[PDB]
Amino acid sequence: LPSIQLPVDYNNLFNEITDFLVTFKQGPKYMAMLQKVANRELNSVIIDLDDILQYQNEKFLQGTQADDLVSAIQQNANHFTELFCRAIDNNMPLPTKEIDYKDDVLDVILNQRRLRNERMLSELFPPNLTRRYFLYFKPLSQNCAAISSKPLSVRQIKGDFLGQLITVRGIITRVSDVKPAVEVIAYTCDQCGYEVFQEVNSRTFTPLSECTSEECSQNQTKGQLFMSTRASKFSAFQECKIQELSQQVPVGHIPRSLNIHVNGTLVRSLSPGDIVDVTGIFLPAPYTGFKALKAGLLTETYLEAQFVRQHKKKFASFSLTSDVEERVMELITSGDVYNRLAKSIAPEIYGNLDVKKALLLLLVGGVDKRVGDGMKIRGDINVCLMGDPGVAKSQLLKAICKISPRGVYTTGKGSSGVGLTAAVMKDPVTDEMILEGGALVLADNGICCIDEFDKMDESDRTAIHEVMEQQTISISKAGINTTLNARTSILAAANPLYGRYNPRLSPLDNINLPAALLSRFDILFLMLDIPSRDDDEKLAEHVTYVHMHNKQPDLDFTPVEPSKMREYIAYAKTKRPVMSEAVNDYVVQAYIRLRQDSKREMDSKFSFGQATPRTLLGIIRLSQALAKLRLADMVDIDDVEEALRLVRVSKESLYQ
Amino acid sequence: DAVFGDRVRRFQEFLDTFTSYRDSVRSIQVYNSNNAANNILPHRIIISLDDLREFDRSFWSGILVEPAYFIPPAEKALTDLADSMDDVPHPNASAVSSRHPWKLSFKGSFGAHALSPRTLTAQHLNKLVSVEGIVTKTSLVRPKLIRSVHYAAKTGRFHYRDYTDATTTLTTRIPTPAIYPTEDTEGNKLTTEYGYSTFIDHQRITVQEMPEMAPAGQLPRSIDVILDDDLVDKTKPGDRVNVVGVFKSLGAGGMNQSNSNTLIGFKTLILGNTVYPLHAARQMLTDFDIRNINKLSKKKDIFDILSQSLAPSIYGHDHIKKAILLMLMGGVEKNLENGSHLRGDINILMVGDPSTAKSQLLRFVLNTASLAIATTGRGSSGVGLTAAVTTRRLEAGAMVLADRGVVCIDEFDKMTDVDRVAIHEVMEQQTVTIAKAGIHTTLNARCSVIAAANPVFGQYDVNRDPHQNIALPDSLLSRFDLLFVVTDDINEIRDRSISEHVLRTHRYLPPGYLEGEPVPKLVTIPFLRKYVQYAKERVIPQLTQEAINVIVKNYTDLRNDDNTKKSPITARTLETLIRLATAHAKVRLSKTVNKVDAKVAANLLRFALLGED
């Protein structure tokens, strides 16, 4: 009933929008996109607010006043999706190329309807019915920066923000599968042969049932309406949920969450377990009909997604733009990348260089193989660290957990073999049975870190056997019978029996693992804490420096930063280097010697069990990883001898 | 109607007379106006109910007996005062029509209206009351609509409307249907302007009488409270709290036609006006405290004074007292630029004969640390001590609850092997991680551990190895910074001294009591708590080359020289030296660690480790 004044007039802002779309350039930037839309080449338009800020600054420096459109579309974001769409529809250019127009049902229907009106004469339909494109806003760069550039945790999203454009940081908990949602519905009248349309915005609607057209009415033609899919307009819909990071929850509270909606080409971007910076519009969800009359003033709410930024680029997302090319050329031209990359893993830890080199080869991994008859062979590498207390095992393990784009960390005592693999939970109130994957599934195509491996129960450790070699999980339980994919490499850490390693016994007595499991690791590294006045002094001088400066001590060596390291590793995981006959003869001859030496010494104090055929393929996998890191397309004997050295060094700790 | 204006005038006279409230309005406004140009303070003021009594008794009793007729005009007058004071020009669209007035809160002298949930009675309805109890439940936060704004497409005019519900206002009005208008009076189609509309936060809680007051094992009684705007989420379950607000009734009570024959009663609530906690830990320093703390720190031997003032009722064990003081101060926690973490908190273990004050000394820490949890070793399971699953929801254990605090474990030797191994992560990585059916999560647990145990043979046997006397694995003993062995060696003068000491202790009488009625210098514990709090917040000592020169030499000699030492020596021993030196420098309020601190830390570790100084 009443009315107020406000500082904003939308006519001025509409004029600014139509100038911006036809003038801005880094021809003008957005007219190329609209030409691609007109050619049917492109389905969505992404508006950059950095452009609008730049445009405002340039117009100001030319000595003229202008409205602050950037804050104006952040404060009340919902309304401007319509203004930009009307401007785009007004200014859309004509096609540059032939289209085959007759493929469109709506074109035929509207052409015939226009012809009917033309004959009869001897808005027509809602404009939403012919918008072939989607439109989204991208928030301000924080380095140019405003609230949309600054991430909020899910607790900080108060009721003040309803209507605004914001950014949210958290973990995704669940994702729905895609289904269609109506936008414009189409009907046919039987007796008078005429078509009518209805537009849907709310969660529910009543379909039409009477032909209220004036011509039909004046012919007293009370015809029947029928619905049609073939000329209705749908859009893809998906719903998700986001939840705050566990390390940001205040003490004694339960974590909170938000509902996310996604439409258009942005669909199936999110996935469960992702850590992500989502940005969008935060809105209420009104009730409808009789429910609204007795629901009260408490409103449900949700987030309309507009753009999504991931924290770590998955290795599958790689493509060699020249921006990346220029950076990998730095490492390639500098040379000796193997040592530099290994030295760059956890620089705050002194020494341990061979362990770091082994863990770099774990990050790269071997080549997947699939024979013409259907047999397949594991490409992943498995590694284990066995050693005394206080030698940085947990610390080094947790450092590698940062580099990998997909990975999880777990400890032996806190873990169930079920929850480690996959569980059949009677989760809903409806008594339904549903399968939910465990840690080894969440680490699919990544690394799984298992600390305190010696504390985990002997029965529960057997769950890992199938995943380690076959990279799959098989379940046959109440109402569920399926196989899941688990393409994951395992890294584990343990103390020997009795804690500190005991020289009175053999290595196998100290290790205390069964034969079938000890074989599934490609490398097991044995590391012992033996005092030395000389080495202890150097280690202490290094650690004390680190505590003093927060920096590793350096005179010669500069580590590569983790980002450039990820780019190099991601580029290196694409190569698939092949073997050759000269190399094959050498490794074939090496394998015989290993088994003969094992047979000779099964009695001996220097025994470590017997070399199985899985030790041959371990050599091939390590060799191929080394070939990948030098960006080759061919394994070289130089790789094989290093792969043998790296296996030999694991046992030298036994000899003080 | 006319009476509303006069009440606004009379409260304006009060606000002009008692000027300390104008300063409050103005200071909040200028603070908010400053940082807006770059957190924000709420538009709320607390008035002393005594000032209002001395100013006008007729207004005082009106607020206190008829709040629905006196609180609204008073609050209106406060908003006019804040609005007439100068404010930033050219407000934005949302600021122009925020629908956000200032709000009141009260303190002091409620008299007869200070109550508890058991005694709140139908006579007190519509009065302003104060209640005390324990929070038991809290709802989720929800937004609530109060105003909406609409733009008319053809005419270019902005329209608006307001909404009400029975819990939003002290006075009573016709309820509103929560519908959005789609069309103008003149037939123009409307659009809704989110971001210009106004929504507020809402939360319901429940408060119950304290269990100490429950009669005869009878059922306890409780009330529901309504909170909104600024008051949301300032409490959690288990809090002891005192709430101020108006006590009111709701609904039709079955007189709107029902099957009950109207035997059922009306519903009732308290509308939260102000909330205060109860202490049942933290203290806030006055200026004089800063002066005294800084002056005392320049004595020659502050460490001796402070350490001997811990548990003066316990004779002997000087070194354990010094170790506990350094534990309460702690080291400095490091986070490196690559995300790597280096531990800061000190863990202590003590093992010894029966009756040698182990449990008695362990009990003292629980009553001087700001956050402390206590448990017996056999009364706790691995999951209960770290974390457990429920319904999926994950529930914290004792080590997760004391995050930045200390945890005390008595009868540590009785804990089973299956329970002990759950602790190996928490004492170094300072986290808890679970991987069970339907759950994977990491939790933080940053505390310091102090614990007591009995040796294997019931008394310590010097004629057998320390490993034979102490049945724990080497990987666990390595995680304790200081390991103390203590025994009851029989000697004449020692026995005489201790016995005379405990007899002098048992002859104490508290100050306010006649004899037989039932109930160097030492700083008082209430001052020592302030000293520890100040030192832990305001000083962060950085390491120096002179300290490092001592630390490196001591570590390499101690590790390499062959001796009958009672604990394994590893890379973690070096960190214990750095932590102890940093904590001693912090006692001294020094901005940097010096050679003296490193020397003292070495002389403490040598005593505990090699048994002799």
Added chain:
Amino acid sequence: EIPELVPVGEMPRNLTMTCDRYLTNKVIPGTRVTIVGIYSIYNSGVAIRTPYIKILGIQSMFTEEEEEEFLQLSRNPKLYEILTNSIAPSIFGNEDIKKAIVCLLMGGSKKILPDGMRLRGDINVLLLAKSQLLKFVEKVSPIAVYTSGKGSSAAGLTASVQRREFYLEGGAMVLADGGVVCIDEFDKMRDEDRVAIHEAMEQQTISIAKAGITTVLNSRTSVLAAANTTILSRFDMIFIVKDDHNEERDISIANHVINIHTEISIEKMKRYITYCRLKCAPRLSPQAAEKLSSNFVTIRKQLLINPITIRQLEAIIRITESLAKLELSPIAQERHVDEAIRLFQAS
């Protein structure tokens, strides 16, 4: 309905009823009452309604002259003998057992220090015929609980966690808080209670951190126990019951049994014990301190040339205070110290 009215083999019938204004909050559960009210029906089959009643009416520290008697008792020169004689008078002999029960009923004095440490007031005794004394203690004590070693539930003696969500319940150590508790066979204690009673006795608390529960329970009580090892160290005094076989005693008991089949009284003594606990909490004189410390070092030296420990010196002090409490003397004296060490011969 009244228990002595119900027809045999049937569970009792009941009614629901309403009251308002001054008739509210006038009664509590378990009380027998008489009611006047209108009997009527209300809405809540065909043409059928529930009945109820509207109520219109319901029916259901010391004086000066009391404490004068207690004061006259306090100045009697043989009061200690009188109270010992008044305890289980049918039981022959066993003088020191009766003396120890008097001290257990009277207790020492609680104290709190400037550094916040807290000093225990209670007493604990163990007995190795014996069934009668625990029942007598249960009757004479102002507050009392009686149990056998297995306990009344899966809580046992101390407490336990049970299960569906988990919960916790306390046994007969938590329930007797503030009073006395007596155990009828201490050897039948369960495994969890064997370890948990250490905290319950030394700390006067029970603490649990299991299945997400994290709480501490109060256990402020004096324990009397009997049976038929290291657990004896928890008690202040231990004694073994003794018997005599006079035929006249059994004949007298049998004659009394036939009579039912065909010195100070309990209530007065209970009220006196209550009065003394409320009025007096006495302190050691310096002479007692020199005496006790000299005796302590003497016993340790004698044992060294041939154990006593501080946790037993602090028990002798509590016994000494409890002996001075009978006289209402505000100070304890060498007279009490002598009888305290004399009675300390548990062996």
Added chain:
DNA sequence: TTAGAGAATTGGAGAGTGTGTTTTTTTTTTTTTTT
């Protein structure tokens, strides 16, 4: 034989009224404390 003026019978347009709606197992997988 056409047609036009007057009377009677029927249909359904459309206006009105009242109404209803929100909201003890038994079998099977998994974690936890208890003997």
Added chain:
DNA sequence: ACACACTCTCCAATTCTCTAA
């Protein structure tokens, strides 16, 4: 307040009948 089921009422469309050219 929002779709439905059911009731009531008035008005004009229709066919039937009588009269005269």
